[PDB]
């Protein structure tokens, strides 16, 4: 249950967008699509991809 509805998705996507709004959509999708439609994989991919502002992290 809850694994992969059907390849890419508009939901999982938007989800990422929220997380990475600054990022570019075409990119986000370019990842999810390149990530067998795996948000998780994408998120991780996006995270790494590019350069984040180092500093303190707590959450």
Q: What is the CATH number of domain 1-59?
A: 1.10.8.10
Residues 6+ apart with CB under 8 A from 42: 12, 16, 28, 31, 32, 35
Experimental technique: NMR
Task: Report how far apart the first and last C-alpha atoms of the chain are (Å, whole number).
Answer: 29
CA distance linking residue 3 with residue 59, whole number of Å: 26
User: 3-state SS of the chain?
Assistant: CCCCCCCCCHHHHHHHHHHCCCCCHHHHHHHHCCCCCCHHHHHHHHHHCCCCCCCCCCC
CA distance linking residue 31 with residue 55, whole number of Å: 26
């Amino acid at each position: 249950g809850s694994s992969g509805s059907s390849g890419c998705s508009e939901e999982d996507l938007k989800a990422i967008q929220d997380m990475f709004p600054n990022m570019d959509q075409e990119v986000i999708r370019s990842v999810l699509e390149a990530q067998r439609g795996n948000k998780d994989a994408a998120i991780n991919s996006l995270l790494q991809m590019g350069e984040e502002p180092s500093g303190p992290s707590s959450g």
